[PDB]
Amino acid sequence: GSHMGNGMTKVLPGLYLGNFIDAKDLDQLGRNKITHIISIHESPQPLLQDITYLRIPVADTPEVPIKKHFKECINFIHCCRLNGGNCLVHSFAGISRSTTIVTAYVMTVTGLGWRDVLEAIKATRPIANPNPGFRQQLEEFGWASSQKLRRQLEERFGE
Ligand SMILES: CCCCCCCCO[C@@H]1O[C@H](CO)[C@@H](O)[C@H](O)[C@H]1O
């Protein structure tokens, strides 16, 4: 009965992962004081009041370059966290798309690789599994952009 899978999962203070159901769960949203949400869905959806949204129209296929949205998502999340908010990143199944964006974020703030990060995320959400293509994009991001972004965030929002 008690399995780590009852609503969005806390990934870090002020950061959560979820599916389309958690994204509409007012009880969950209130419980976790969610003030920001990143919706990674192919189509626009009615937005809940008192929440700041970031829409990322991307499908879950290994050919889709979600890496093109890493910078903006990480900046959105960071701003929200360092300013006392709570961000929920979600995708329909709560499996690969939202997971990819959050992994990229944690990689930049910790300086750790995507495998260790993904494995750490799985501990608190065993369904976590970005598609093969997103994992490669995570590979790139780790090598290239990760570190630069960390320094950038420090500049834009401070440490
Ligand atoms: C996870 C449970 C899925 C139950 C059947 C869902 C059928 C709709 O399918 C869903 O369409 C969405 C776009 O509209 C896609 O983003 C999702 O990946 C896709 O599963």
Structure tokens belonging to residue 45: 């959806």
Query: CB 94: neighbour CB atoms within 10 A?
Result: 23
CATH ID of 8-159, from 3.40.1790.10, 3.40.50.880, 3.40.50.300, 3.90.190.10: 3.90.190.10
Question: CA 13 to CA 158: how far, in whole Å?
Answer: 18
Per-residue burial over 113-147, b if 16 or more Cβ lie within 10 Å, else e, is bbeebbebbeeebeebbbbebbbebbeebbeebbe
64 lines ligand 1 (CB under 6 A): no
Distance between Cα 1 and ligand 1 center (Å) = 26
For 85, counting Cβ atoms within 10 Å of its Cβ (0-12 exposed, 13-18 middle, 19+ buried), the class is: middle
Structure tokens belonging to residue 11: 């990934």
Question: CA 41 to CA 89: how far, in whole Å?
Answer: 11
Answer for the pair 85, 50: CB distance below 8 angstroms, yes or no: no
CA distances 92 to 25, 100, 146, Å, are 14, 13, 26
**Mapped to the 3 state alphabet, what secondary structure does 108-146 carry?**
HHHCCCHHHHHHHHHHCCCCCCCCHHHHHHHHHHHHCHH
Nearest-atom index, ligand 1, CA of 59: 16
Residue with tokens 């703030």: 109
Please measure the distance between the N-terminal and C-terminal CA atoms of the chain and give it in whole angstroms.
Answer: 40
Technique behind the model: X-ray
Strands, E, within the chain: which ranges? 9-12, 15-18, 36-40, 52-56, 87-91
127 lines ligand 1 (CB under 6 A): no
> DSSP letter at 47?
P
Question: CA 23 to CA 97: how far, in whole Å?
Answer: 14
Q: Of 93, 120, 121, nearest to 23 (Cα)?
A: 93
